[model samples]
Target chain A: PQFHLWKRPVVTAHIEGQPVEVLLDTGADDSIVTGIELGPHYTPKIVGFINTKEYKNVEVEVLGKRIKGTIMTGDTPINIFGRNLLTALGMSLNF
Target chain B: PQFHLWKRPVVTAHIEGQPVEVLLDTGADDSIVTGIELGPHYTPKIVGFINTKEYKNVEVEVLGKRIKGTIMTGDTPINIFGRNLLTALGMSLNF
Candidate 1:
């Protein structure tokens, strides 16, 4: 999908058949999805603006492909679609 | 270029035969390079951590491709390769 240079790349992705908006952030290392119910409570070493929660094996679909990986949950303004899944999908920022 | 998910995607780019490390930040809308001697820079409206200067027709080489466009020079921690030049080079975040 094409993105603009005026704002952050916020793209629509699918999670459990629901369409959700996430910021496609190449600067970010890990993904963070909020307001979604996920189980298997796990803790990671890194910290966020607040205490963060890690959910392993969480799956989301983007561009008709499944991206399964660990996602962080915290008090964030927007969901971040990070490189863990971006790399898993063989995504490249090419010029 | 290949990048790891553990950190931000930073790549080496050339500016007037000088190799510089810049963060390939898809999240940022505009590019910013610090500590560079540029003249006749016009001012942009957006405010950064400090006053920012806008330099037009600035050129940089990445992946052996010349990306000539406007670049911001400010008191930023790192040089950010933003979407302005990325789009000019027909760069895509593709899978």
Candidate 2:
């Protein structure tokens, strides 16, 4: 997709078959979904931005691609579509 | 350039002819330079991650491209190569 500088890059993602808005965060390494229940267990760590938590082997679909990767969550309000899935999507920052 | 998920996308930027490490942050709309003196006057604002200050019409070189754009600064330690200049550099996240 062609993203620009005027606004935050947000896209629709399917997590557990439910559509949600997620920020396309190239600054972040792992995808994160806030206010959602991934499972019972979560690994706690600092996710560059803050002290966040993550669940591994989570399934999510973005831009028609289904991916199984780590998704983080914390006190943050928005969902982040980070590089782990971005790489899997073959996404690149081209000049 | 090809960036991977294993590390943060950081590039060497020449600000005022000095080489500095900057994070290529597609998640951010405007570039920010922390702990640097661009000029005497700065406009205070919230820059997604935090409440910060900015100087407009700042010039920096990235990937051999010189660009004049708005660059924010604050208590943060690292410089961010955000989208304002990224767009000027013709950078895009492609899948």
Model 2, B1-95: lDDT tens digits are: 64555578888887766677899888877676765666668788885469877778777887878887777777666678877778877777676
DockQ for each candidate? 0.47, 0.59
**Candidate 2: Cα lDDT at A93:** 72
Candidate 2 lDDT, tens digit per residue, A1-95? 65555567788888767777998888887676777666669888785468777778777888878888777777677678878878877787767
TM-score of chain A of 2: 0.77
In candidate 1, residue A93 scores what lDDT? 71
Considering summed lDDT, which 10 consecutive residues are worst modelled in model 1 chain B? B40-49
lDDT score of residue B13 within candidate 1: 79
User: Each model's fnat?
Assistant: 0.56, 0.69
Residue-wise lDDT of candidate 1 within A1-95, one digit each (tens)? 54444566777887655677888778777777777766557775356357778877767787778877787777787788888877776677755
Residue pairs in candidate 2 whose N, alpha carbon or C atoms collide under 3 angstroms: none
lDDT of 1 by residue, B11-70 (tens): 787765567788888877778887766666577645535778887776788876886788
CAPRI grade of model 1: acceptable
